[PDB]
Amino acid sequence: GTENLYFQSNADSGCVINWKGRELKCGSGIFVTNEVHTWTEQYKFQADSPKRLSAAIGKAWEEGVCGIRSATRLENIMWKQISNELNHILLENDMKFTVVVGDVSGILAQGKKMIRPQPQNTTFIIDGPNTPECPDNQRAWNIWEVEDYGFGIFTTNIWLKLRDSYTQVCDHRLMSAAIKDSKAVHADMGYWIESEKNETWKLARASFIEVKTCIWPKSHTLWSNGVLESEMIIPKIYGGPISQHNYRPGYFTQTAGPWHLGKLELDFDFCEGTTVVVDEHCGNRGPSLRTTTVTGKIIHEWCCRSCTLPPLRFKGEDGCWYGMEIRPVKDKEENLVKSM
Amino acid sequence: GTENLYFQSNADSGCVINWKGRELKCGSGIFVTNEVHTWTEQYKFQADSPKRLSAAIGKAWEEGVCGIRSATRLENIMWKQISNELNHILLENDMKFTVVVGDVSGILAQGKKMIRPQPQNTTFIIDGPNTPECPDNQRAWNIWEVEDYGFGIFTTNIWLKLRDSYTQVCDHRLMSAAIKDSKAVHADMGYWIESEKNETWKLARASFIEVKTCIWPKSHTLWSNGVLESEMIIPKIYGGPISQHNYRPGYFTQTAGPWHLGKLELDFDFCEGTTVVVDEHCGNRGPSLRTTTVTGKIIHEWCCRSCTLPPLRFKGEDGCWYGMEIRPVKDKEENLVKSM
Amino acid sequence: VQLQQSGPELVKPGASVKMSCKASGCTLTNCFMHWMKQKPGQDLEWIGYINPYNDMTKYSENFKGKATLTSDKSSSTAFMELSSLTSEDSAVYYCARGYLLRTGCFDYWGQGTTLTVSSAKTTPPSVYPLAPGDTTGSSVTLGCLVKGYFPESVTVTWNSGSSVHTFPALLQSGLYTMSSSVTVPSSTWPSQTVTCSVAHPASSTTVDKKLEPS
Amino acid sequence: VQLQQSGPELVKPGASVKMSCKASGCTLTNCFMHWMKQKPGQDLEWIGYINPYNDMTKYSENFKGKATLTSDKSSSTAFMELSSLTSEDSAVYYCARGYLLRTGCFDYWGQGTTLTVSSAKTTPPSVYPLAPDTTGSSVTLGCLVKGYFPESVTVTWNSGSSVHTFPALLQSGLYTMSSSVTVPSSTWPSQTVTCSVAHPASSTTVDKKLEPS
Amino acid sequence: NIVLTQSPASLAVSLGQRATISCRASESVDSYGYSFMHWYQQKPGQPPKVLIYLASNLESGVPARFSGSGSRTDFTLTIDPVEADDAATYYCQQNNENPLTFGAGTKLELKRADAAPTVSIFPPSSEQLTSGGASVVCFLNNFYPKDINVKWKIDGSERQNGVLNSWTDQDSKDSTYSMSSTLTLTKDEYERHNSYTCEATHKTSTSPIVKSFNR
């Protein structure tokens, strides 16, 4: 038979399938998608004008900007691919320094300076590890905003322009959020944060390709009223949405969580070969521990003072980690792995 | 050529097109759609057990409830369709009253009592016009919450159960919101509320198939921190999302807007054949006026004290209306049509 | 605001008709063309309205399946079409300027389009003069008998401009018969010449009869 | 915890091969089967790992299209499969127990599976004795294993004196090697000396008695 | 729907008197503080014309003897003093809610001092007698009241066959009626009898007004 559907010229129009729940839903609106697993081929950051960019770095380096830290992994890939062309522009212009772009290890830490657009001493180091002769407080950071999207099938370009003033707040042009019935998502080029209502609204799982240190923009936050920073599971300083969707009963902010892994998977489930019990006598919450020692021994018995089961767990390249509240009931023995 | 896309079985999966901007986006996530134009064919409210419902109305009426007001337009259509089946249930149970269901006029006014679930005087009146011998404060209201969805092509059933206690907050199982880049929607079976960032985030346009009087749940709200009720264009008392997206620079809450029309279309554009100018000399903001006289004369010249253009306007069955801030430049004269 | 409606129509049962209404002197903000159906000497029924510029249209429930409103902006004209036709539809259809729901009144009206729904065929009338060798007074009355035409109506004019009387047409054997009398002073007749002019548009026949005594 | 890898393989260009690694003494928490490719006397290349109980696998970037790690929980055995095969794939593939990323080292190692990718055909070797008409205090004898494919052969002298085994060289598309033994001249040729040449890839054994002209 | 019921169905009023028509709505026609009610006058064969718009507003250029009043459901049109021109049907209409609806109408008939009918008798035409038919016509012009019965005498026998009568609308100028009586026969039947008579009995006189002619 026949049904009737509304479509609009300038909104996302189409049909979409939900295999479980077996729902074909067609209409017009906004389709929030998970861009996390596809990002390297699907999106490409691109600087607006490499010539004018080099000029802005010259003015910065002249003014004492030691280096740059990318905010987002996409920005790093952008610097690596434009670095070779940048150095050539600087050479032709009798500038006495070079631009070097290193890897992105772990957290994309925040620098305190900015790169103002234009109309040793000898290396301008972008990212890589943290270096004392190039302190973060001397690097520019979060210096790009999105000017336009370059939409095409396959790849999509994202053209960037330099900001004029400093801001800790993430660039909302890359961000999204969505909720329907009993499911909600805050999402990013690098964050996918799922919350759901089962009797009560809580954080159910998240996926991180990067850990950034911009602040999540309130305008792209669901349920942002009356939020307590101490109650945010994903900490505010690592871009956690300042939202009550970012809550979870019995857990507090994961400031010492394994965010150093730089890339990780959060959910609520036991780690392989462990058990957690609620015992008020447990040790207090502290920096998250990895369930496996340096010698590959698995830690059997864990506990938490007043968390709620299932346990908050982070899975990484190097194994499983438990939230700050979970502690080894057998106390410290052996070679424990803790985050810094 | 070949591309790479992430899909998930238990999310909204598919491809979707945006004609302007020519963006085909495929993935998995959340598809928030505009359900207002298709609702009569797409969704049907349905009570869980007409027997269990019938006994609860008897127990309510014995406790002094004379009638009900529907919370939502769908709920009213439900009472009309089930009334024949309820009254047959009541006669078999020798209940000394019958159930009569009337139209939905204008705002879906709010009742103060509740219908508690189970394990003159002669009529239990549902909806209709406002009646003093069965006043609102003697009627139950917002008594249903969604139990399960009936997922299908064509029609979707929405099965509802009576609540356990009274609540002013709309049923969030029916509601949704979403935002991506610089577009945002708060959305409902009857409200579609669009906001966008053009230099600044603001309310852009809305579509109302009903005007209801529940409160919009914070949990499904974008940017719900620090909202001043006086600045919410759609008033909180008619379900305005308590969000900074429900703002518009230079306008205040439209408590005296033409919400009586019961179904209307808000955006920011001049009405046909009128002009608005920003003039401190204008009259003060007051109850909304219709741009067409009682005699069909069009009112040419309008102004506002400190609103911003384009002017906030409502389109309705009997014509075009301007937001409260807009006033006739010739001051009160002539045969004016004003709202409540 | 001047409204001009289409001409009369004769249509077979079950067929369809589309009549027009052009509106001079209108603006975008008014200019809602309303349509009403009135059987001879019966209550007016409201069908709906259409705005030639807006394409806003609203139909009444009784007419939703029956009538269809359309518009041409440049012509600033409204069109109404009547789906399967029955004798219950034979009436005068009025075009008239109005407004939206709680707005104005019916300011101005077109002249009205008469529709006659019938299998019968167009038949022009016979015109017989009516003159009185008898008694005479300071006034003599003359007449014309218009007999056996379909469909209604005819216009009977006397010299194009005295007291005149026009009599309603009656149905006999499936055709119409009417008459028209005029009174002029008998000092003028038959010394003066007097002619009754009968016009029947649907047959595009015009017949004059000179009045002379038997 | 001891790892036993499958035997050597000769596979034609363009085919596919699947080799094994069985791990006794394993637990779910450890027992990550890592795989490494080492050409003769070169750097080791890391391919990836698979955990037979978890079925967790990780590949390095170079090998994503080439290797496929698969698993049998019950036999607690790891399989590695090598996609489009070329002469460039001929090397020794080592299986070794490890753990996840920043945990432990390669504790225990398998014996190594040698792979030869070639159009050439298996050829059994010729064994030629090597004996000297002049006399000394000490005498050296040899066996010349010539004209065999593929590597390798085993030359044992009486099955258990000083012995030297010399690496195989390729000439005209087949391998040639030699092996020498040293005994005191009071012992030879009164005592008997036989070299046993075993060429498993052709499953032939050739013994030669050493006697002097 | 909002149903307008108008009372009375038909009204007879004398020159100069006060006329009152009422319209009763099934639901309130009041919104925004106005009464969305209107009064129309329709002369026969003509489009309707507005008199009062909203409850109580005299239409531009309509004589001030027309006046309107009322709110909610009950409304009243007053004509004072009613004149010879106002012989017409009067409609009320509402546009507070869709569908727009009208009253059934009030036909106003004027009362004047009674008047006798001017009777005229006309033989069948020369053109008609040759075509195979003959019709004798009698014109009764400018009489009041409207009720009247006519009598045709052929050679002294009353005649009751094939007679059709039509009444006109009341004249707007003198407030009188008229009527045409038509005797329809074959051509041959007319020539078999010689004398023809038209006889009208009216409220004016007891003895009928007679007009006749012969061949």
Add this chain to the structure above:
Amino acid sequence: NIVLTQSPASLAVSLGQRATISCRASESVDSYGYSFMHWYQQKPGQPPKVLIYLASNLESGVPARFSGSGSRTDFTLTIDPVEADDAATYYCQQNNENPLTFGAGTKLELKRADAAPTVSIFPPSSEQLTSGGASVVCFLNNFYPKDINVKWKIDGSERQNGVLNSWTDQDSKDSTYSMSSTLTLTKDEYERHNSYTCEATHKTSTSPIVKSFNR
């Protein structure tokens, strides 16, 4: 990837001395307070063995003469006293970031006092001559250093065709090398010449060590 560069490529150390190898990583291999760096020994034809795990932890059952040091970028495997068994290639590897990567290796060679090669000449066998070919074999046994020149003389004229040389790996016990030179010609070509000579010149003495045979 994290690149490990090992120096030196090859290192020669005499019995009882100290050998020091270094491993330099392109990025810090440190996490959680550990250095994720390891040292392996690979005897030829054999899988590697772990010696030092983490920067500086002696593996079970490894002689305490092996030791490790360093952190972050720089690491050092030291052997003191180097013994005869330690003839092997030595690898460093990291497991701080994927992919796991290895060093290029340090081939450790032992130094002892020179010893001259026991040269032996072998005529072609009786079984070989019947298949149409002849290989004259020369074994140069137990010499050090590895440098050596071999020369074939037929009838006193040098020969440069069909000479293939194979060296062994250094001895696990005595730390000497050996080498088989094999001059391969046709059988008929074998009969045209009478006296065949093998001449190997070594660092021990200026006058080469000669061995010959006749038909």
